[PDB]
Structure 1
Amino acid sequence: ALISKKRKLVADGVFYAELNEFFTRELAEEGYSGVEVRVTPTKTEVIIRATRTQDVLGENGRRINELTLLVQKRFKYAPGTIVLYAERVQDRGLSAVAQAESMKFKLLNGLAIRRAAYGVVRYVMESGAKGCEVVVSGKLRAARAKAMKFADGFLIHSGQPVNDFIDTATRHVLMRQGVLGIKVKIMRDPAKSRTGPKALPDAVTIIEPKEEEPILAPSVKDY
């Protein structure tokens, strides 16, 4: 035991990183996204936020059983001291990473190039996003590299609201001839922000006065 506070919090962050990697590698065909550690007394609560939990889970509870074991044996927990859980994510349409691996799996399933992104854009927008972007930067069919911007709606690109509102995802899709880059951008409608700032700092709304009937010489009422 017995650690620096400094050393620890960093150490935790690396733990996160490795953990998120391993799942991102392991649960692609299940639409993996994110983790959250939730440490407790007596337990450690890894929560897998994929889309197709039935696959994450496995026959009356296998695979997550395998995956636990895995995560377990490596980082050296003590059977029971760590626990796993599948959690289908509220609308995949607003997770960059969700729609990245979508298009990976679009192109990779022999799909037109624009049909991929123009689909992904359409679904993402239709899912209630306020803005979306798809770069495809790479090499297809012909020898030279190209790129392609696919976008619709509204995005902002600078300063803090970026951190707050736009999700970014790059993914390397390894095809026959070379690889290409998928790059996904979703901008979430700041209106619905829930926890956080609920607009653009840009936003300056005026409250709308009132028609008033003036006149009427004095007079007072009693009570």
Structure 2
Amino acid sequence: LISKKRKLVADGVFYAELNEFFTRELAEEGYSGVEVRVTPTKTEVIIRATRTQDVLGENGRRINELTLLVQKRFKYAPGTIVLYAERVQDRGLSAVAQAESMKFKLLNGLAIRRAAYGVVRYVMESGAKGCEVVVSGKLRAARAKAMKFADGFLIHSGQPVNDFIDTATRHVLMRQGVLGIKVKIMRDPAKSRTGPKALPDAVTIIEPKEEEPILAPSVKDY
């Protein structure tokens, strides 16, 4: 018995707690976000990752223990919580996955300039309208500085930033300190299919069809 004012708040924290658990466990499984759907007597959780086999494993081994891990912490009875595994559509258009790819290249000794252009190039090739990757920290020297890499064009103000831009931030641990990674990807409004299909300032006019003058009063009887 909990009031709806506190129930929804406690539901969002459950989503928040469950979200950070996966990003710390499936960090090498390409975790790309989670969704929680509540049904009476049956609670289901949808995991979205790039590698559906690793999340599942043989006989659903990984998903079973992950489902069982949630059971112990949240005091949910067996048969009430069930986890799913689903691939992420258009992996090039998800900022979280591409943020991991940027982190992956740096830890292997790859150059900062070439690797940064690699992330933005794949995102652009995947149909994204715009992409921006920001790297900050001690790059080649003790004196820290920021290096921004971007392509296409990204809006910065107004409501459509929420609609069209996905932002991902991933800390990177290196021997010289911490390098910050920020990734913003702007998808094409023409493929949104949820809400707005274009920018608020885009006006498209249907071309009228010309028709020659009849030049004579005539009747088509029936």
Both proteins in one fold, TM over 0.5 = yes
Secondary structure, aligned partner of 2:170: strand
Asked whether the 8 Å contact 1:172–1:180 carries over to 2, the reply is yes
TM value normalised by structure 1: 0.96
Query: 1: CA distance between counterparts of 2:118 and 2:134?
Result: 13
TM value normalised by structure 2: 0.96
Query: 2: CA distance between counterparts of 1:209 and 1:167?
Result: 38
What residue ranges of structure 2 are gaps of 5+ in the alignment?
none
Q: Describe the superposition over 1:101-147 as per-residue Cα deviations: whole angstroms up to 9, x where unpaired.
A: 11111111221112211111011111111111000011123111011
Secondary structure, aligned partner of 2:28: helix
> Which shifted more, 18-27 or 107-116?
107-116
Instruction: State the aligned residue count.
Output: 222
Query: 1: CA distance between counterparts of 2:114 and 2:172?
Result: 17
Query: 1: CA distance between counterparts of 2:53 and 2:159?
Result: 37
Shift of 1:45: 0.6
What residue ranges of structure 1 are gaps of 5+ in the alignment?
none
Asked whether the 8 Å contact 1:107–1:116 carries over to 2, the reply is yes
Query: 2: CA distance between counterparts of 1:176 and 1:58?
Result: 33
Asked whether the 8 Å contact 1:94–1:129 carries over to 2, the reply is yes
Secondary structure, aligned partner of 1:180: strand
Secondary structure, aligned partner of 1:29: coil
Map of 2:55 onto structure 1:
56
Secondary structure, aligned partner of 1:111: coil
Asked whether the 8 Å contact 1:129–1:188 carries over to 2, the reply is yes
Question: Which one has a larger percent strand, Structure 1 or Structure 2?
Answer: 2
Shift of 1:205: 1.0
Shift of 1:208: 1.6
Query: 2: CA distance between counterparts of 1:210 and 1:81?
Result: 60
Q: After TM superposition, where is structure 1 displaced by more than 3 Å over at least 4 residues in a row?
A: none
Shift of 1:174: 0.9
Query: 2: CA distance between counterparts of 1:210 and 1:47?
Result: 49
Secondary structure, aligned partner of 2:49: coil
Shift of 1:215: 5.1
Asked whether the 8 Å contact 1:141–1:177 carries over to 2, the reply is no
